[PDB]
Structure formats: C-alpha cells, structure tokens
Design a protein around this ligand. Structure first.
Ligand SMILES: CCCCCCCCCCCCC/C=C/[C@H](O)[C@H](N)CO
Ligand SMILES: CCCCCCCCCCCCC/C=C/[C@H](O)[C@H](N)CO
Lengths: 59, 251, 178, 285, 114, 251, 178, 59, 57
C-alpha cells in the first residue's frame, strides 16, 4: 500500500514509524524534518589557494 | 621558518619572529626512573594542573638599565597548584620551558642577552659578610643590577660587569643562552632539564638556577618613536614530581 | 561611543604601562552587551540552550615598525576576576608575538559541569572571564605614531550546537503595519 | 508493500587527546585579511582528553527553524453596520506586517517553499443597552482572489459565486480551517530584497512592492442576520515547508517602520558599561 | 510527559442573568525562560509566532499533547543539598535547578456583557 | 575472617573485629570515560597525593547522646593537597572509603547506626524560614542532633526521630549503612562511588552526601568500668579528578 | 514514647520473669500501628491486595557476657491469642539461642484460604499473631548491667506481591501551595 | 506497514494485539507497560564478601 | 510487513518441598551488623509442601 517505515528520533548513551500519503499533490505532504546536511566551507573558507592551518598564512 | 607555536596544558604561545629553540645540553626533561631512584613512596604527578605557562611581572627597559635576574624555583611558589604542591611536599623535581618577549619597531636598536645559570651562588657587598634571603630574590619581582660598585649590609655585590659571581660577564656564553637583537627577532626560548647532583630536592631550600637578562647594547631611538618598551617572562614547568606529603610548611 | 566606529577599536600605546589592564569581559555569548548583537549572539538569542567551544581572534593594526607581545588569559569560574598579570598568568592563556602574521587565536574550551548552559545565563551556569595584559610593551622608532589599536573577532568552533527554540527579545511592535 | 527508509543522524565532532609540543607548526597564527576564518580547535592550543560527543545539530536546520505557524494578519468585520464596507474584511497577501516572522525570513536573500495556511476566527456580542437574543451558529466565507479577478463591492455582490476562485465555508465551534498552497511565483524563488525599480527609466516604485503581486483575501459572514450588532475577528497563520534558502544576511538591528520599505531610525551598536575593564564581582561573603 | 488540560466555565452570580453567548474559546501558551511576558489580554505577545500554543472550544474533548525530557542535566533532580552562589549562600535547595518556563491562559472571545 | 587491612597512598588501616565491607550499590569508584564526558580540557589526576586516609576530630559518646552528622565534601576542604586542589579548580569528582571506629570492653553495651545519605536536603526549625550554611556544617567538627524539638533562627530542625528531613529514622536502612553492635564488632566500613546527575560538579556549592551516626541503644555500663568512650571517623578519596584551573577562590 | 528512640527498643532483664510475656502483636502489615509506617507498610498502603511470606529479624544488644534463650511463636487465626508459654508452644515457633551470631530470623509463612488478603484487613482476612516468651532467662556476671534491649526488623520474602493500586491515606492538604 | 504484533496480558491455571506508530517522534509513543525485570541484590546484598546463608555469618 | 515481539512474563518463585533435618547448617542465624538482609524462605525453617506459584509482579 505504498507505506514507508523509517526510524524515530531517539537519544544515545519499536523505534520506527509508518507513513502513508493520501493526496495527489506533493505540496500536501508533511514537513521534511529528518535531513541534516552541512557545507560550512562555502562561507568560512571561500579562498582560491588552500590554507593548511599548520603553516603560516602568508610567506 | 620563523613562526612557532608551543602548547602546554591549557596554555599556548605563538610567535612570528623567533630564531630557534635551545635545548640546554641536548637533554629534554623526563621523569625519574627506577634504577636511579632512592625515595620509596609512590609519587604524585599532576601533569596538566602544574605543567603550563605562568607569566611573571614585566620590567621597563630604559636607556640606562644594567639588567635583571630571577631565581628558580621560589619565583613560582605562589603560582596556583604548582605552588600549592610545593607547599605540601618535602621533595620535588621539574624541568622548564622559558620564553622571553620584547618587541619594538624597525627604527629602534638594542641587544639583550638571556642566560640560564645553574647554581648561581652570589657574593656579598661586604667582603666579610653574608647575604640575606631577601637580597637574593623578591619572588615574582626581579632584582636589579647596578652600574657601579655597591655598598650596604647583607646586599649582593651587583655591579653588572662581574655578574654578582666574580667572573667576566662576557664569558657567560658558556651557559645555555640566546640573544634578542632588536633588528632580528623579538623573543628567546630555552628548554632546561632538571640539573642537580641528587635525583630530587627540597624546593624551598635550594635555588636550582638563575635567569639573567643583560643589555649589552643600550636601547636607543630617535625623534618621536615610542619611548615605553617592556620585557616579559613566561615559564612553564615540565615533568613535575613530588614526594613526601605532610602538613603545609610556612615561611 | 555607542554610535561611532571607535566602539570596535581597543587602544594600546608605548611607554611603561605594565600595570594597566588592556581589556576584560565575561563569557556570556547571548546575554552580555559585548556579545549579544554579533552574528553568534544573534543566532543564540533564538534558542535557550547552547554548548561548545568559542574562538576569539585578535588582529593588530599598527604600523609595520611597531613590535610587542601581549598575554591573553581566560579564567574558569569560581573565583573573582584577576587584578594583575600574575594572577591571570595562572589560567588558560596564550602569549601573542606581533609579527608578519598579524592575527592570534585564543580558543575558549568547553569546561562545564553540565552538557548545556542557559542562553539567559545565571550564577549557576556561569563560564568565567577573559582578560588581556602587556607582556613586554610596545616599542617604536622615531617618526611613527605612538598609539595603535587592536580588533577582536568572535566565532563558534566545530563542536558547537544549540537547542530549545524560542522567540527573540530584540524586535517588537505596537500595532500592525510595521 | 512496505519500503524501509534509513535516516542518518549527524552528530558533532569529537575532541582528540593531545599532549605537549615544541615544534615549528603554528596553528594559532593566522591572517584575517585573506577573508578566511581559522579552523582551530582546543586540541591545537592546549592539552586535551578524549571525549566522545553525542550532541546533534538537529534543531538548527533550516526546516526545523522555519516550520512553525506564525500570525501574519488580523482583521475585523461586523454583521450589521451603516458603512457597507465594514461588513467584510479584505487585504493584500504578504508577510511584512508582523515583525517576528518578517525578521526571521529576512535573514536570507532568497527563499522557496510550500505553505500551510490556518485561520482562527472568533466572534463577540457588541456592547449595547439591550442585549439577549437567540441566534443560530454563524457561518463564514473566505475567498482568495488572484490578480486580475473581479473584486466584490458589498456582501451581496455576485462575485461571491466563487465559480473558479477557491473558497472556504466554515461554522463556529469546529476545528480551525486549514489548507496547503504550493510555491507560486513567476520567478525561480521568492525575493525578500530587491534593489531596483519598476520602470526602465530608473524611477517609479522602489524595492519590494515591485515583485510580489500575489492577490487578495476577502472574508464575510454568510447568515446576513443579527438584530443586535456583532463583531468577528479573523487571524491568518503561515507555516512554510519543503524549504530552501540562499544568501545569508546580517539580522535586522533597527526597528521596522512600515511594510513597503526598509526605512529606519539610526540605532546604537549595543548598550554601554562603566569601563572597558569593568566586570562585576560575584564571589563575596 | 503527556499533559492534559480540563477547562470549565460558569455564569457569575448576579441580580440580572440571562443572555445569549456563543461558545467560548480558550488559548493556552507556553513560554520557555527568556521569552517575552504578556502584560494584558490584548498584548502583542499572544501572536505566538514561535511559542507553542493550543486553541480550544468548549464542548469538545479535553486537549492533550506530549512533551519530551527537557533538562540541561542528565536527569531531573527532586532533592538538591546545595546553594546557587559559589560563596555558599543565596537560594537553597530545589528552586536553584528547575527553571522550566511558565504557562499563560486567556479567553479569546473578548466578550461577556455579564 | 574478621581481620582486615586497607592500603591507600601512604596510609594503612588494620582491624581485628570487623564484620564485612559495604559497596554502596555494587558499584566501585572509577574515572570518567570518553563517551560520558562533556568538559573538554585535559584533567589532572594527582593519584597518591589526594587518595589517602584523613582522620577528622573525635566525639564523645555519652549516656544521653542523640547523634552526629557531617557533610561531604567541605569536611575535607582543609586537608592537604585534596583541599588545595579543591580551591584552585572549578570542577571535581571523587568516590570515597569511609571507616568508623569505636572500641569498648566486653562489659559495655550499646548500638550505633552508620549511614550515608546522598543529597540530604534539610529543613529549618522555623517553617517559613531558611537555613544558613553554618547550621548545616562546621567543617571537620560534627553537628549534633537534639532529643526534643528545636527553636532558633536559621537553624536546622534537629530532633533525632525525624533526622532533619521529615522521615521516620527507622527507615534510613534504605541507604548504604552498617551497624556497630558493641558486643559484635568495633568498626564500620562503607565504599561510596560518585553519585550525581551530572558527570562533574563544583565542590564548594554542592554537598554530595551526609554521614549520620545515630545510637539506637544507649551506652550503658556498670560499677567501675571505663566511662570515656570515643568515636573516630577516617575518610579517603578515590579516583579524584579536577577540571577548570584558575585563580584560587575565597570563602 | 511516640517521639523518642525508646519506641524501637524492647526491654528484657535478668531474674525470674518466666511468667511475663515479652511482646505480642497482630500480623496486619498495612493496617496496624506497629507496621504501617515501615518501608513494607508504606509500600503496601499504595495497594489494595497483598500476598506472600514475611521475615522478622531479632537482634540482641546486650553486653558480650549476657546469655539467654527466647521462644518466638506465631499463631494462625481461629483462636484467641495465647496467654502462657505452654499455649504459644503449640504454634509455629523457633527457639533462639543468644551467641556470637547475634540475630535470629522468624519467618511467617503464607497460610491462607484465599490467594490475597486485603491491605485494609477485616475479620474475614485475618492472619493471626506473634508472641515472645522467656525460654530460660537472662544470666549475667557481676559488674555488668542487668537490663538490656532487643530490636526487630521486618521485610518481605521472595514470593511476595501486591495489586490494585490506590491513593494513600497518609498525606493530605487543605489548599494549593503545599 | 511496520506493524507490531505482541501478546496480551492474560491469566493462568486471539491473545495478541497489533500496533502502528503514527508520529515522527518517539516521545509520542504509548507507555512501555510490559517489561518486568528486577535486580534486588543491589539493595539487599551490597557486600564485598559473599555470604552463603547456610554458614554462620561471622567466624 | 509484520514483526512479532515476544513478551516474557516474570512470575514469583515457587516453594520447594522440605522434610525434617538435624545438621550443622544454620540458615536462621545471621548478623545484621554487616548491612545484609537475610535471604531465608519458609522452606529453610519449617516443613513445607510443593506449591506452583503463578502470581506476577
Ligand atoms: C480559500 C483560502 C485560500 C487561502 C489563500 C492563501 C494564499 C496565500 C498566498 C500564497 C503565497 C504565500 C507564500 C509566501 C509569500 C511570500 O513569498 C513569503 N511571505 C516571503 O516572500
Ligand atoms: C501549548 C501547551 C503546552 C504545555 C506545556 C507543558 C510543559 C510542561 C513543562 C515540561 C517539563 C515537565 C516535566 C516534569 C517536571 C519536573 O522535572 C518533574 N515534575 C519532577 O521534577
């Protein structure tokens, strides 16, 4: 029946849930809360020549 | 080649104009081992709470400055847990990293000598007299050399040419040393191992080494350059060990 | 100085000023006036809990002929703030030597008994203080200015996170159409 | 048929153990003039122990940061009146009148998403000397008009036929109405800031009001009733989902002035303290 | 936790009774520490842009929602033999550690001749 | 079976009339590990200079004695290097070995209860009032219970039947405990791990546990037996750790 | 004695006291004053039904030179409580000899016609009584106290269980903020 | 569809039930009523040297 | 997809049959000073029949 089973948010130191889509448009679907990606170098390291961080910056 | 970083404990020193590092006699500090030990109780090794950089008070390098010295230990007996461990134990052992800092512009000139002297026994300015403990050391405050011969009771004969020891000062290069030439570099770094004739010793009774800072070429500048030029010392103990825990002593 | 660029500049100068402290402030990245309107503080004020290490970068903007060394120290909480270079010497510190590389980084590491501190910090979740002192002093040749300035940048490290979303207290209105 | 989907949680970096050091590597010396932020950690500057860090950056993602309902409009309308225009409410759609949602959205230059729209409607008996009646439950009609549609003139206008416009009918006492709206813009993304003009001669309308153009909302009572006067209030709530944003910006410092412009009054950088060295004493008997 | 609310209403005693009111609606808002506090029943803070709120109408089933474990520690503490200040004074015991926000509740109709 | 020896650091305890040892909840003390840590700086571990037996002051068990209590830590803040490390750091962690001693002849009689209570929050003898820090603890000196209801400002309600906590004293057996029955044994020994809801904590602000000593059967003797019968406590910390070094605090 | 430690101490002494009973009480672990505020009774008062065996431990706290023997007896219900050692001798009993081991355990076994008894016990779900008598007597040498005390502990065995949760009658209030 | 089938509570001397999770957070799940473990020795036997119970306690 | 989860019920201990005895084993003599609670059952102190106990905690 086109069900999806995925894991729930838990802690660290029976845990999954099921979902069905009812509507014909994807703009009716619930929010996408479980996607956690990053790419910080876009803003923190926007330079042409790579800087090693153990070497001096200049010279 | 001129940049350097040193990390110890939760403290870090950077520098951009260093020369090199001096390892006193090619020997790095290390702990006491079993075939060289005499004291039998198990020792304590705090290891990050004591082995870190402490900064003393600064001095002002003037156009007529003869020089300065400090005594180690007893310059660090009020520095945190290192000092507290010194108060409660009978026997202690440690090496050191010393770092001296003095920056100035490309329009100043001067030259300092930075030297570590083990067992620097000093003489009194009265020939048939003896020194007081206050005359040898004021803790984290530096003692000051003179430019002429000195008088007074219980005080050290401190004319800079004899270095308080009856030698020619220009020979002090036999000891571990560096130079700070104001046109070349802005800091000196010396690594000193434990140097004694017994494996451990009491840290209040015995001064292990003296740090001396002596300007050979006086500070000089021109029309409206900066007049205030300070010098700063920073020392970190290494491989610190203590034996003989009892109640705290009092001076 | 609240409406001028001088608010960003820390002043230093040559001569014997070893007894004078350069600056000092509390480590309260979301509450103290020094930090609450920077990018990091602005992000934190949407949240209730924070955790992680902080980076402070210091840049020297004097002439190419000025030299000097500074001591940058951080003291965890439990005692009052140091009143002399000798006391601050006992904390977590770095000795900065001004040279061809113009910038030094002091890292404040996460030392805490709880996993998180409150963005609205109280006595219980305090974090300590930062102070700066003259290690040697500023020396210059003739024909150069004698006073100079230092600037300071803040950012967050790669172990940093926040939680418990809330509304911010920095924006408001009295009626609609605003 | 069942299909398993695996979720990867992203926790923060551990700290590695580090001992003493005496070398030529200088991690602490940098140069900000390059435009580069230093990537140093505590392990480069002090001695550290090994820590296994389990914290997650889950609640600071854009989707979790933005997916919460917020009010964007409030309006009133009466069941009986002598003005003929106070019997229905109407407005032009945007998110610029309530400051919290506006400032939150304005951290980014461009945004794109779908919306979930909720309405909250309440009523009240108008103050008077003669009270007391027996009214049936009130019903409300909400109609959305895209640009170019005919505009209602009164509460009995033919335009309430809503042959092609979407409408909602609702009765008091039930759960609040709701519907979802897709990403509807002639561009590839919504624009929060526009440094330009509407006319090719560099004049006309400046800035935001050139680009939005997303229709109007009209709301009326359906009963056509009330021997004694009554008032209703409608409130609109927005929640974005399936979000993407581009080009972060510094957050707003000055207070907002109007909904058409970015105009402001000069404000200080922060608040003052006694001294550049001042830090209060907190350890005292 | 699972939190449930039970809400009831009543006509105040008076000499003149009898009216025709529509059903009453209620708003419940939770404020974590540091949030702005409402001053009255028409304060802007009831916009609830980021605070979670519940709206409810009389005659329906009682409202309900679930709350996760929210404490800056690893567990809630029922007893605390300590102080709030590092000089061993200030606030003693339990009130040092809890700090979990406030709850505000109002009518929505803004009504009631009687 | 009745003889026991315990060694820690440079200290050793013997006994010839012991019963057994109580490990609080079957958990021995241990250091904090990496998947449970939050604080990032490297910690110090002195390891023989702090983990050793300290002996407090004795009390006199009289025919009419209600009982005694101590608070831990803050009973050991003036004990050598353990106390000195407490003064200089923000965060500390440690378990303990507690040993209680009381000897008497085969012609005396009496029964003491020895119990350790984590987070023993206490009440004031004025219902709408609060306690002072002095009323909870006098350092190495014990506080004393009462036999009747108490009055006074800022003082703890200390009638022995309610144990200062509003419970029935005969239920205190839910906690780690032993008994000293004068006909059976002469010492009690409890090993207590670190018990908190966070991995580390500040040692001045928070009392981790209270030691209570309560006579259930009063001391009794006959014609010319000895009248003076003292009780002595001795505690040794175990697996001690400290984080957050700064300048020394002051109370 | 309700506010003193003497409430916990059972008195005994030397001499001819064979006719005097030491103690006796009903077996009502959740209702009788003797048992309702102990740990076991406190747990039971949250429930309506209980079942299982009970342990009573007795410890002798006299000087190391006192000797004696006691008889500890338990009588199931159906008759009145015994008035002499001879009658109590006919029930379930143990003879305790005071020695280097200072503690004796009397176990009350589950003898009942129903699977469960009411925590709020009535005539129908009664369980009997416990009594203590001098088996020989207390003998001491010169120079020792002549009076001594015995203490008693209660706990539950490994066949014990409860059911039918309810609110407890031991806590109450008149208004909020308490 | 990620269903779970487990046994019902019955007596001693057609008995199972099914469950589906609907929400994305595990803090929304129902209570965990069917887990019955114990470790009483933590409180009743907290001693270093094991006591046999047929042997005398001391000596 | 269905997934079976098995629930383990934990009932209380049975009592074992026991007869007369005359030996040196003394289950009834203990020492509370140790901090230890005695783990004796009725079968150690009296004669008992075998019971299969079905009660659950
Ligand atoms: C019958 C009831 C229908 C309700 C109609 C609601 C439609 C609302 C207009 C759709 C567009 C709203 C999407 C967001 C608009 C702006 O782009 C954003 N606030 C940011 O720019
Ligand atoms: C819109 C309605 C939201 C309702 C908000 C209810 C939140 C209640 C606060 C959450 C924390 C409650 C958890 C228990 C608190 C204490 O730790 C325990 N009572 C024991 O200490």
């Amino acid at each position: 029946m086109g069900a999806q089973v995925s894991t729930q948010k838990t802690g660290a130191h029976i845990i999954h849930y099921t979902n069905i889509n009812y509507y014909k448009d994807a703009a009716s679907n619930s929010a996408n809360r479980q996607d956690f990606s990053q790419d910080p170098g876009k803003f923190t390291e926007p330079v042409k020549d790579i800087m090693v961080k153990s070497l001096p910056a200049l010279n | 080649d001129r940049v350097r970083s040193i990390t110890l404990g939760n403290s870090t020193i950077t520098t951009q104009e260093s020369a090199n590092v001096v390892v006193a006699y090619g020997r790095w500090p290390e702990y006491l081992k079993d075939n060289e030990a005499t004291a039998e109780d198990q020792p304590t090794q705090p290891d990050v709470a004591t082995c870190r950089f402490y900064t003393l008070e600064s001095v002002t390098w003037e156009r007529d400055s003869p020089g300065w010295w400090w005594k180690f230990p007893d310059a660090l007996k009020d520095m945190g847990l290192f000092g507290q461990n010194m108060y409660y134990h009978y026997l202690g052992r440690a090496g050191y990293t010393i770092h001296v800092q003095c920056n100035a512009s490309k329009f100043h000139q001067g030259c300092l000598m930075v030297v570590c002297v083990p067992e620097a026994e000093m003489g009194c300015s009265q020939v048939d007299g003896t020194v007081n403990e206050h005359s040898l050391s004021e803790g984290e405050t530096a003692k000051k050399f003179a430019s002429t011969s000195t008088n007074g009771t219980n005080t050290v004969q401190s004319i800079v040419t004899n270095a308080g020891m009856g030698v020619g000062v220009g020979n002090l290069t036999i000891f571990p040393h560096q130079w700070i030439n104001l046109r070349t570099n802005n800091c000196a770094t010396i690594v000193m191992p434990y140097i004694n004739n017994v494996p451990m010793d009491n840290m209040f009774r015995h001064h292990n080494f003296t740090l001396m800072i002596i300007p050979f070429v006086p500070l000089d500048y021109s029309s409206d350059s900066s007049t205030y030029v300070p010098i700063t010392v920073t020392v970190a103990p290494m491989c610190a060990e203590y034996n003989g825990l009892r109640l705290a002593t009092s001076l | 100085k609240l409406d001028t660029m001088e608010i960003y500049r820390i002043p230093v100068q040559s001569g014997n000023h070893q007894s004078s402290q350069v600056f000092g402030f509390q480590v309260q990245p979301g509450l103290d006036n020094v930090f609450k309107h920077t990018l990091l503080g602005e992000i934190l004020n949407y949240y209730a809990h924070w955790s992680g290490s902080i980076k402070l970068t210091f840049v020297f903007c004097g002439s190419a002929m000025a030299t000097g060394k500074f001591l940058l120290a951080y003291a965890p909480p439990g005692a009052n703030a140091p009143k002399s270079r000798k006391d601050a010497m006992l904390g977590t510190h770095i000795i900065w030597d001004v040279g061809l590389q113009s910038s030094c980084v002091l890292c404040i590491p996460w030392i805490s008994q709880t996993h998180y501190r409150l963005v609205q910090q109280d006595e219980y979740t305090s974090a300590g203080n930062v102070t700066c002192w003259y290690q040697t002093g500023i020396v210059v040749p003739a024909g150069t200015p004698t006073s100079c300035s230092i600037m300071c940048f803040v950012s967050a490290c790669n172990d940093f996170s926040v939680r418990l979303l809330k509304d911010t207290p920095f924006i408001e209105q009295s009626a609609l159409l605003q | 048929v069942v299909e398993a989907v695996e979720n990867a949680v992203a926790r923060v970096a551990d700290t590695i153990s580090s001992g003493p050091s005496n070398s030529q590597a200088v991690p602490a010396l940098t140069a900000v003039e390059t435009g580069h932020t230093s990537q140093v950690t505590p392990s480069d500057t002090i001695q550290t122990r090994h820590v296994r860090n389990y914290h997650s950056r889950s609640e600071s993602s854009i989707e979790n940061f933005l997916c919460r309902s917020a009010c964007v409009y409030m309006g009133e309308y009466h069941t009986t009146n002598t003005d003929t225009s106070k019997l229905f409410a109407s407005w032009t759609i945007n998110a610029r009148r309530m400051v919290q949602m506006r400032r939150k959205l304005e951290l980014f230059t461009y945004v794109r998403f779908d919306m979930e729209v909720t309405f909250v409607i309440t009523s009240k008996q108008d103050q008077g000397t003669q009270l007391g009646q027996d009214m049936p439950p009130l019903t409300h009609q909400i109609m959305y008009i895209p640009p170019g549609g005919p505009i209602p003139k009164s509460v009995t206008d033919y335009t309430w036929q809503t042959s092609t416009n979407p409408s909602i009918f609702w009765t008091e006492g039930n759960a609040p109405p709701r519907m979802s709206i897709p990403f509807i813009s002639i561009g590839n993304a919504y624009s929060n800031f526009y440094d330009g003009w509407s006319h090719f001669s560099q004049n006309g309308v400046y800035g935001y009001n050139t680009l939005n153009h997303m229709g109007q909302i009209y709301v009326r009572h359906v009963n056509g009733s009330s021997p004694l006067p009554m008032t209703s209030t409608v409130r609109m709530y927005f929640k974005p989902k399936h979000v993407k944003v581009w080009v972060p910006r510094p957050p707003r410092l000055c207070q907002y002035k109007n909904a058409s412009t970015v105009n402001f009054t000069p404000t200080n950088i922060t608040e003052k303290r006694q001294s550049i060295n001042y830090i209060p004493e907190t350890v005292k008997p």
